[PDB]
Amino acid sequence: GVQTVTLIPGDGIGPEISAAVMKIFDAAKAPIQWEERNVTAIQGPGGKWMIPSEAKESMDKNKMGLKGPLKTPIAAGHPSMNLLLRKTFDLYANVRPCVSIEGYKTPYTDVNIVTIRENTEGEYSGIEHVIVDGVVASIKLITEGASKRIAEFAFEYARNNHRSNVTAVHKANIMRMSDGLFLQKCREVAESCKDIKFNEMYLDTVCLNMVQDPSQFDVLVMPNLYGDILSDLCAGLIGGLGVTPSGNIGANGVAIFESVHGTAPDIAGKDMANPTALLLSAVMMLRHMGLFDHAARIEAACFATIKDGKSLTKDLGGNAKCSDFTEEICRRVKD
């Protein structure tokens, strides 16, 4: 039947582009119902910030969320938005598929890379110690359960999206014990998935090769800090964060698909925002739900809308508005 997805439009241009996805999704006859929610943290008992309950309950029920850019909170004790969500839903895999867009020129044209970043430990452990004045130790945390879990999803991802190879990216030569254990758990899963080709590379090698020739790469899986970086690198190869979809897969079947770009408060209200990023994230969501045929159409009908280039938005090297860009996609998703 038709499934309900929790919609989190966010702030600034978020509403405008969430509206745009809702209309594009409607033209596709896509069996999708929206349930708006607001994730802005509130002060819970003792002042400990939290996601609102209706936000949590609705995600735990519908499982799928579509979430736009969020404002940066100003209170100092206030924890990171990404951190709150990650901990509230156990979002353990961050997924960034980067694909060269036919009509948007960059120095790279043959790019098709999916970076799967472990999203819960590594150097982002949140553990630091002031050892003595002027000397700080930041604890990087690697565990076998988390490294096994992330490697199992990369192979899950490659199987479900017909992906040829998976590369584990690491620095086991420098961090022998921690990155070695990550690379070890990758290897062990790699043997129970012999139908996906697997290999290892060093992070520094991957960055020098990434920029000489990105075609040589496919699905990549690495520890946290390395993914936070490589994913932005790879997004830099296809045109920035405005054309870059993002997924966060979590516990209990929960996945939240988001735009990684900012609120753009100066162009809010104006018909100037670009929805490509959030829309492409919505087709990430569709494929995640198994609505491959619907996703393929909305995807193929936005690539087309950019290829002919008649009406890009301000950022994409064009002069048109959010209405026209949206309307072209609606028209073409009907044939």
Binding site: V136, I139, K140, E144, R176, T205, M210, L233
Partner: protein
């Protein structure tokens, strides 16, 4: 003459070093290399005490043991396009300044439980200040106009926050140099998109490794990009991109452009300026004319073919 200790190292190292000396012979470079045949260890430091300058291949860790005994705290990589060698970002000119003694690179790892590994990353006020002043000292001596501090201080609020703090402090003693700050993952995205927005970049150890090899990819890769590592006394000249498969080629394949350019930058440090520029110009011309290119630059030429072409064109400038 001028004594310089030479650590050929492994892989193409001994071959790239054979190129430095065939080109130095051809240019009548007044330098006598003192060759430490294998990578006990302190004889290199006693040789470094008198010579003060070295040129090395590749080989805690073995090579980051050497860097502690010689206090090579500051690493510098010159990321500059070569006019003949076309890439996706031509006419680019950046310098990467990397701290080399702290961070993850001291193997402070243990097992706190079955299947739970801790790695310590160390950041101190001492070495952050030293690399920040180095970066601004670099930018003024060489006449660059901007220093960008790369960090991840929004997540590692201490440690990376302490690096940023120092950097911001030293930045105040250098008013005619512009000082910006940029988050490590955003900076990597900018390097592939608009690398032209940077000048000098100063960062800690691991980010350095990342940006070192990233930006070397912008301008032609590990075959052409020179590096050098300083202490307060010592200068040691190496290649810029130091990843594990940097030049994992067989005999007579590798590109000596990286080592030779860094060889010319050593000659400048030795105040042998005529020779430093003669060898630099030869390399850059031979590359621009296009007759002879190593495989990593496209051409079919061996490494001997390429460096003896350097030799011809540089005995000519000594007409």
């Amino acid at each position: 003459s001028f004594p310089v200790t030479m650590l050929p190292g492994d892989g193409v190292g001994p071959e790239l070093m054979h190129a430095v000396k065939e080109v130095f012979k051809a240019a009548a470079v007044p330098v006598e290399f003192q060759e430490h045949h294998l990578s006990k260890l302190e004889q290199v430091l006693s040789s470094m005490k008198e010579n003060k300058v070295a040129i090395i291949g590749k080989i805690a860790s073995y090579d980051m043991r050497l860097r502690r005994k010689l206090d090579l705290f500051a690493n510098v990589v010159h990321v500059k396009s070569l006019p003949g060698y076309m890439t996706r970002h031509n006419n680019l000119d950046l310098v990467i300044i990397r701290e080399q003694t702290e961070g993850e690179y001291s193997s402070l790892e243990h097992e706190s439980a079955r299947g739970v590994i801790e790695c310590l990353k160390i950041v101190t006020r001492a070495k952050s200040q030293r690399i920040a002043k180095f970066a601004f000292d670099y930018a003024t001596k060489k006449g660059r106009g901007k220093v960008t501090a790369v960090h991840k201080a929004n997540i590692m609020k201490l440690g990376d926050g302490l690096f940023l703090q120092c950097c911001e402090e030293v930045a105040e003693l250098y008013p005619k140099i512009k000082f910006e700050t940029m988050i490590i993952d955003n900076c990597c995205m900018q390097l592939v998109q608009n690398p032209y927005q940077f000048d000098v970049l100063v960062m800690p150890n691991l980010y350095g490794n990342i940006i070192d090899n990233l930006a070397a990819g912008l301008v032609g890769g590990a075959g052409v990009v020179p590096g050098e590592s300083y202490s307060a006394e010592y200068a040691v000249f190496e290649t810029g991109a130091r990843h594990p498969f940097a030049q994992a080629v067989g005999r007579n394949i590798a590109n000596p452009t990286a080592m030779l350019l860094s060889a010319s930058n050593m000659l400048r440090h030795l105040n042998l300026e005529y020779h430093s520029s003669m060898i630099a110009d030869a390399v850059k011309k031979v590359i621009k004319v296009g007759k002879v290119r190593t495989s990593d630059m496209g051409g079919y030429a061996t490494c001997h073919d390429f460096t003896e072409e350097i030799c011809r064109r540089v005995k000519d400038l000594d007409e």
